[PDB]
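Dock sodium ion; give full complex structure.
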Amino acid sequence: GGGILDSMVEKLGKLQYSLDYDFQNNQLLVGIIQAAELPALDMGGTSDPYVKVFLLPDKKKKFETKVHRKTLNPVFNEQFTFKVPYSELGGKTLVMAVYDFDRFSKHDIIGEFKVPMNTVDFGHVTEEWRDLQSA
Ligand code: NA
Ligand code: NA
Ligand code: NA
Ligand code: NA
Ligand code: NA
Ligand code: NA
Ligand code: NA
């Protein structure tokens, strides 16, 4: 069953987020809440996680949480706002990507996932845990 095991979702941790569309101010609100069970490094190391948060296909610069040093279970508790009228949302996709900050080399991705806005349930707050997907 090795081929089948290789196809399984790898244990790269999970991110909890929330989402709500503010119809008063016409903006998408995103909560980056916390991550859990991020993978250990070699030599028993922990990573320095942060999250990038952004819409596709939009080309504007990505939002980022603070970096949380030396933790596999960070609590971010950050909010981000996207000023996009509802009518223009559905064709877009929200991306959340967790990276390992390093000062001296490329920041390795830990993993990512995507939320197409056309299967967002508008008008109720969305909150879930999502397994980070390999990249
Ligand atoms: Na696997
Ligand atoms: Na694998
Ligand atoms: Na493999
Ligand atoms: Na994975
Ligand atoms: Na997983
Ligand atoms: Na995972
Ligand atoms: Na956590």
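Observed: The domain at 10-135 is CATH 2.60.40.150 (Immunoglobulin-like).
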